[PDB]
Amino acid sequence: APACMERQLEAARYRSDGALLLGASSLSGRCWAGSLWLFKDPCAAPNEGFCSAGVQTEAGVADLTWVGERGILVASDSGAVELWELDENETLIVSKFCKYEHDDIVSTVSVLSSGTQAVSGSKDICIKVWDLAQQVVLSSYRAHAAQVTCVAASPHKDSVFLSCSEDNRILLWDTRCPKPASQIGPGYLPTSLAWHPQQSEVFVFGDENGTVSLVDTKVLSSAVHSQCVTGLVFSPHSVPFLASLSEDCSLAVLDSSLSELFRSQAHRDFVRDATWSPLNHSLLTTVGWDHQVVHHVVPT
Amino acid sequence: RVSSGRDLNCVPEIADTLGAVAKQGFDFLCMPVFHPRFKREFIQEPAKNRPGPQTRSDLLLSGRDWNTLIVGKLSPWIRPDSKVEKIRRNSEAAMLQELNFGAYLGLPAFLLPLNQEDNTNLARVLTNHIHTGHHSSMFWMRVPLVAPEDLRDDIIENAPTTHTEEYSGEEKTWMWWHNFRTLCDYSKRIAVALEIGADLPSNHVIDRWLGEPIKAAILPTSIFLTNKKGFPVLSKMHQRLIFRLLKLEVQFIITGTNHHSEKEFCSYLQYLEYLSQNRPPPNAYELFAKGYEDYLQSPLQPLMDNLESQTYEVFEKDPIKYSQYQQAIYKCLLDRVPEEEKDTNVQVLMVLGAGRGPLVNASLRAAKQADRRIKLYAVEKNPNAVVTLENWQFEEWGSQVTVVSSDMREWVAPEKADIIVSELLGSFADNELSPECLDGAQHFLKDDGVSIPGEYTSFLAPISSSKLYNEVRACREKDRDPEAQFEMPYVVRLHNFHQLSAPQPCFTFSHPNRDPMIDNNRYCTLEFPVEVNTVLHGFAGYFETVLYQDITLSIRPETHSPGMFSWFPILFPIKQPITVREGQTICVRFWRCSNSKKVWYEWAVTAPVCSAIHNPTGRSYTIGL
Ligand SMILES: Nc1ccc2cc(CCO)c(CC[C@H]3C[C@@H](n4ccc5cncnc54)[C@H](O)[C@@H]3O)cc2n1
C-alpha cells in the first residue's frame, strides 16, 4: 500500500460485509493525485498502516462507487472513468480499465440496476452510459448547458437515472424513449440527488442554498443547511432516514417529513460523503477534507 | 511555425506535465494555479481556518518558465454573479486571491470564462484588480462562437431546441464580450480567447468577431474529423476560419483528451503546422507591410516639413507608381507631338515637387521610348533633396534638366509648360495639399497644357475596430486637449478591423482647374447601408487618381494597384463609438476647410445617432500651407 494517504477525503462507501471503501485526493501541495483504500475494520480508518488494501491513482478522486462486492468505479480529474478490482484475497487493488472519454474533470458517477452498466457526469457538460464488460461508452448525451453536478442511477430500473447541472435543470432519464431526458419542475441550482429506495417514483434533491426538497415524479422542502447540499444518502431501514451533507461542515439526519432528528458539527471542514453500515443500521460514517472518519450513533 | 499551447484541467505533477507538453511541441501550458475542485471559505468558521498550504510552491518552476510557458486559469466554481450572496462574496475573495497569485508568479496571461449573459460583478472584480499594484499580466476572456445552450443535443422531450431562426440570438456570445469589454472601459490588458465549436454558426456570427482583440483561438479535440489513415483533420469551413485566424497571428490552444487514441497527440498540432505551410505566401505588398499592421502614424506633410533622405529612398523603391507615371507621360507625348513634328517640336516638361528626381528619370525614360525631344525643369522646395538633384544634374542629366530650388507657388517660370508632373498625393489624395500647390503653379502651364495627375478622388468606408479605437485612445499626450487624438487622422495598414459598408467617393479635384471662382473647400454627405449588427469606431480613407486617360493609380481595396505600397489607408476615428443594428444606414458628413495659413478636415456622424463635430476650426489637426 502507499506510505501515507492524501488529506482531502472525497468518498466513503460500505458494501454487504461492512468493509469501508475510501477515496482520497490531494487538492493542495506538490503532487495533485488521489488513492483508494479498503478497511475491513472501519474503526481503524483513516490510519494507513492498519488497512486491508490501498493503491495510488494517476489523478484525484472526484467521486467513486462500488461495482458489486469486488469492483470500484472511479471519477478522475484526468477526464477518465477508472474501474479497479480487488484480488481473490482482497489484499491488492488492480486497474481493469482507465478510459479517457471526458474532455474535462469527471465529477459524478453511479452504477445502474443491472450492475453491468454505469452513468458518469463531467464538467465537459456531457453524460456517458458505460458497458463495464466491453469497457466502452454506449451513449454520449449532451443534454445540459453547464457542469453536470450529480448523476443518480434508479435503484430497480436499469434504463432510468436522475441528473442535475448548473444550467438549473433536473433531468429524469429513460434510455427507452427516443428523446430520453425530461426536465422536472429550479430557482437555486440543484447540487445533490438521491432516489427513495422503497418508493420507485420518489427522489430528494439538495440545492446550492442549503434546501433539501422531496419530489414525486408524477413539493415538500426544508432549509436544512446554511450552505450548498453536497450529498443525500438514505438509511438501509424499511422506513428509511435521510442523511444530508454540506459545505457548512455539518451533518443532518431527517425523517419522511424532512424534520431534523440528528445534527453533528463534528467535522472542522467540508463534509463530502456519508455511508450507513449494513451490520448496525443505526451507525452512520462521514468523511470530510479535515481528514476525519467520524462514526455517528443515530438516535433511531 | 505556429505558436500553440495545451489546455489542461488536470496537472498531477507540474514538472512532468510541462516536460510532456514541451515534448509534444506546445510553446505554453494553460493550467489551474489552485486545484479546480479545491473550494475555499473566507467568512464562515470552521472552513475559513483550513490549514495551508492553499496551493503549490512557486519554487516548482524557474521565474523564466512562469513568465513564458504558463497561462493561469480561473477555478470554475468561482461564480461572482451567482444569485446566492454567500457564493458571490467567496467568489470575489477567490478571484482576487487567484489573480493576485497570477501577478506574484509573473504569468504572461490568465484565462477567465464568459459563459453567461450577466458578468457585471466579474468585470468589477477584474477592473478593481487591474487598478491594484503595478502587475503586467494579460487577461484572456474565454468566450465561444456558439453558447453551449444553443448547441445542446435535442434530447429533452418537454424542452425542445428552437428551430425558428434568431439573428440577434445567434450573436449572443459577442454581446457577452461587448458588455464585459465596455464595463472594463476597453482595457488594453483584456483580450478574447475565442472557442471554436464542432458546428460553426452563420458567417454573420463569425464576422461579428472581426476587429476584436483575439489573442487566442481554443480548438477542442472533439471538432477534429478522422481521415482514412486515422489522423485528425478539420472541415473546409473550419480550415477557412483557421486561415483567417493565422492572419491575425493568434496563439492556438488544443483543449480536451485525445479522441484519436490510435495516433500520437502531436497529430493535432502537426495538422495546424501543415495548414500554416499550405496557406498562400505573402505578395510583395504583404511582405513590405509585414510589421506595420494596425500601427498608427502621423500623415506626412512634405509641404510644411522637409522629408529625410531615407523617407525619399523608401518611396523610390515602389516600382509600379513610376512605371505608371512613365507610361502616362509616354502616352501624353505621342498625343501632343505627332510623327512628322518629332524633331521640330521640343515639349517643356516640369516636375513640380521633384524630391531626389524619380519622376525626372521617369520623364527621361518616357521621352526615349516615345522618341520625342523634351526640356525638363525639376522644381523642389526641400533644399536637402535639391543637393541630391544638383549632384545628379552635374554627373548625369546635364543642361536637359534645370534644377530649381523654389516653392512651386512662388517660382517665376522663364517659359510655360506643356506637361506639369507631380506626386503631391497623400493617402486621402488631397491631404498633402496637391490642390493648393498645383493651383499656385497653374499660371505657368500653357492654355492647352496637361497636368499629371489630371484627376484624383478620395473614398470613405465605415469600420469596426475595438483594437484601433483602443490604439488611437492611447495616443493622448500631456499639455493638449485629452480627446485631440480622436480629432486627427492616422495613416495605418488596417488589419484587425471590419469594413461595415462599400467605399463611396468623398472629394474630387481636376487639374488644370479652369473655374472663374476657384474654391478647394468641400462639403459631402455620405449614406452607408450596413447589413450587420456592429459598433462604428471610425472611417477608413482611400483614393484613386487618373495620371493620364486610362493610366491610373488606386488604393481602393476593390481597384488596388497590384504591388503598390507607397500609400497605406488613412483612418478618421470618432471620440465615442456608435452601436449600428442590421438594416440601419450610417450617415457621415465630411468638410474640407481652409484659410490662407491652414487646410483641415471636419467630420460628423448624423445617423443612426449624432457624434460631436470632430476637429472644428482645426483645433486638434491642421495641414500647413
Ligand atoms: N503619401 C506620400 C507617399 C510618398 C510620397 C513621395 C513623394 C516624393 C517621392 O520622390 C512625395 C512628394 C514629396 C515632395 C514634394 C515637395 N513639395 C511639396 C510641396 C511643394 C511645393 N513646392 C515645391 N515642392 C513641394 C516636397 O518638398 C517633397 O520633396 C509625396 C509622397 N506622399
Number of domains of chain B: 3
Give the end-to-end Cα distance of chain B, rounded to a whole number of Å: 49 Å
Strand order of the largest sheet of chain A: 1-2-3-4
Percent strand of chain B equals: 25-35%
Q: In the CATH hierarchy, what is the superfamily of chain A?
A: YVTN repeat-like/Quinoprotein amine dehydrogenase
Distinct ligands: the ligand Nc1ccc2cc(CCO)c(CC[C@H]3C[C@@H](n4ccc5cncnc54)[C@H](O)[C@@H]3O)cc2n1
Number of strands of chain A: 27
**CATH topology term of the largest domain in chain B:** TIM Barrel
| Shape annotation of chain B | elongated
Number of continuous helical runs of chain A: 0
Globally, the shape of chain A reads globular
Biggest interface pair, residues each? Answer: A-B, 56 and 50 residues
SSE run of chain A: EEEEEEEEEEEEEEEEEEEEEEEEEEE
Q: Supply the helix-strand structural class of chain B.
A: alpha/beta
Distance N terminus to C terminus of chain A?
37 Å
Largest sheet of chain B: 8 strands, parallel, barrel
Portion of residues in beta strands of chain A equals over 45%
The share of residues in helices of chain A is under 10%
CATH fourth-tier homologous superfamily of the largest domain in chain B: Divalent-metal-dependent TIM barrel enzymes
